[PDB]
Design a protein around this ligand. Sequence first.
Ligand code: UDP
Ligand code: UDP
Ligand code: GAL
Ligand code: GAL
Ligand code: MN
Ligand code: MN
Lengths: 274, 274
Amino acid sequence: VYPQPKVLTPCRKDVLVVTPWLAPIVWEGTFNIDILNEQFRLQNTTIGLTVFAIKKYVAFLKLFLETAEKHFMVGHRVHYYVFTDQPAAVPRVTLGTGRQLSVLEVGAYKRWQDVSMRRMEMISCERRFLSEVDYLVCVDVDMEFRDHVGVEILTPLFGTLHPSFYGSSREAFTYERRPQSQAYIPKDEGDFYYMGAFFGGSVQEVQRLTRACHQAMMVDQANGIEAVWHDESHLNKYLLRHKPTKVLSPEYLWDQQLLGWPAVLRKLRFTAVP
Amino acid sequence: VYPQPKVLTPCRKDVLVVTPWLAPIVWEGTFNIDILNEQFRLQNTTIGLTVFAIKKYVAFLKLFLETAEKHFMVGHRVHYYVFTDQPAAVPRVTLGTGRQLSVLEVGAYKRWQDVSMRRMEMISCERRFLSEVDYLVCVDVDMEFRDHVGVEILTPLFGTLHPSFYGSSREAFTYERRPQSQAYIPKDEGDFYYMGAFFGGSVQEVQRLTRACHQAMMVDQANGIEAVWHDESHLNKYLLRHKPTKVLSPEYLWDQQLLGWPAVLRKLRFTAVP
Ligand SMILES: O=c1ccn([C@@H]2O[C@H](COP(=O)(O)OP(=O)(O)O)[C@@H](O)[C@H]2O)c(=O)[nH]1
Ligand SMILES: O=c1ccn([C@@H]2O[C@H](COP(=O)(O)OP(=O)(O)O)[C@@H](O)[C@H]2O)c(=O)[nH]1
Ligand SMILES: OC[C@H]1O[C@@H](O)[C@H](O)[C@@H](O)[C@H]1O
Ligand SMILES: OC[C@H]1O[C@@H](O)[C@H](O)[C@@H](O)[C@H]1O
Ligand SMILES: [Mn+2]
Ligand SMILES: [Mn+2]
């Protein structure tokens, strides 16, 4: 027993709720969470969440993890995978039932470009995700959850609209524009500008995507060019060619300090920390 | 190179384009057919179309088939499966490249209820669909195509909004309301009223659906009740419990003689014949 959807009275008339390849764009008021929760519960869905916390970024884990417990996939099985050069630095956060955390120890890379960039490499570690989770969600650690982020996001492949470019035209998009880079996207192409900080999908699609992006980055290195926004550039080139089956609205990646809280955002769910 | 989708200016503001379980509702202006065509071509998609033409309904095949050739999945591989008690009566219609037709001979059933109802049984013939097509589309024969019906419909499971109930409230829906019938749907439930004349999906999902509906009809027979709208009733009960991954708007099942051509319908694609 829920509100009857009515085909002649849309809920959101202010935003695009479907892409032109028929992928939902996820905004508050587009979904009934109760229907979706049942769907995903009926398959005993397990969602993995990957997060890197290399060098000083271990400082962000406590709030990340505490807020994930309040807001992320609450009621579903969750497995956190914390990639860190400092395992002893990972805070012990008490978890809800059916939720667990693994610490994966990795190398502290040369500069920030590589730490951000080698995530694609480090996520692709492959045998294990396939056995343990049905979906993988890949996010920045320097963030907090402030509202529901749940199974509405889950789909074979998704990316998230960069909060600075959702209202913008495409020649404005900061894609890689040098044809020397595997990340190259011409000035007459592109659907959206996706942020590197929040993407995911089924384990098979995320392994594909991260393998591709790593193979593309290595090809650029061997040719002496570094895409302008690094992993985000390659992410955007992958998602142009392999279109995501859901797109998350900027409700899912926001910075209230830089951008306020406009009326088109009914919820701010996952936000940057200073 | 196509129109850039703009996230703050929806194309359709007059209709619901997404269900509350995040299934697209397919209306003109929600999709770019060029993007979709490429997607489906890249997988060499084959679509099967099943149609029953038992007794006098062989009379409808010539126009059905001629118009399907102009409008249905044009450019993609298509396999028509014509179920008939009269194989010699099937018109020879010249087909486009990559399109073929098989005649399947079956029994002329006792009354019209059973002819319509035993379709579910006759579609479920199982080994063969799995090998030959990726999707199955199941329609009435007493119809003509008048405009594009293409790969925008394709998804694991879809149904179509009955053209007489899309603007209506749910207690108005002519679901089966006797609890004695497997088709029973309470007065406080239901998302939409789907018509029996146009549903489909992947071969696996259509085999599931048609197996379920046949198993449900047989259980009702053994109990001496016949659902009020027969196969359509069971279809609607299946789609309540297993929600379709796309819903087709009434653009995909219309009767211009009974309903005109309202402004909310930008195309009339598949329509009833007198
Ligand atoms: O020294 C570093 C730099 C980056 N990161 C990881 O790489 C992500 C992206 O980096 P950052 O957040 O600095 O990029 P921004 O959001 O500022 O563009 C971070 O959230 C961390 O998960 C890290 O763990 N240690
Ligand atoms: O004598 C019959 C009655 C029905 N049908 C098939 O069952 C479908 C549904 O029947 P009908 O079109 O009469 O139902 P309606 O659309 O009038 O509700 C038809 O399109 C045919 O495909 C048939 O082949 N021969
Ligand atoms: O334009 C691309 C850049 O946009 C900035 O706003 C953002 O901080 C960068 O991380 C990168 O996304
Ligand atoms: O209400 C259910 C009935 O609605 C009629 O308009 C239609 O002709 C019937 O075929 C059946 O769908
Ligand atoms: Mn960050
Ligand atoms: Mn009919």
